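User: Hello! I'm new to structural biology and keep hearing that structure can be predicted from sequence alone. Could you demonstrate with Galactoside-binding soluble lectin 13? Please show me the input and the output so I can see what each looks like.

Assistant: Of course. The first part below is the input, the amino acid sequence of Galactoside-binding soluble lectin 13. The second part is the output, the predicted structure written as tokens.
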Amino acid sequence: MSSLPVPYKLPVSLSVGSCVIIKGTPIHSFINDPQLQVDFYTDMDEDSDIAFRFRVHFGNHVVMNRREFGIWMLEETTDYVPFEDGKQFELCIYVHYNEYEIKVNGIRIYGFVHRIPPSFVKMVQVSRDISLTSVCVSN
């Protein structure tokens, strides 16, 4: 009604210089392990490979990884998660030549190096404990 379906699937084409911009609000923040997940898939089904998963445990940490043929690779984390319960955030994922750069409300929190070319990404999926207002791919 007032927000997009979650989980949400958007077909995309990414190039160097692209930015995936997600606007939403953390909800259910009183539960034990509230989360946000963003997956960059290489095809339209959820069994396809994942170039980049960004999984936030709100108030705790972010875990990032890549899946090929069902197998997860080298996991990366940071405890820098500057979201606010019940307040809208702007999550920007910039596609650079060498990495995805993740900014939360304008502040870089991480850079995840490409394991496969970002041009291989065909779909972005947003899931878990958010209300989702908008998603798009800019430039």
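User: So the tokens describe the shape?

Assistant: Right, they're a compact way of writing down the 3D structure. Reading them back into a model, for example: The chain has one domain: 1-139.
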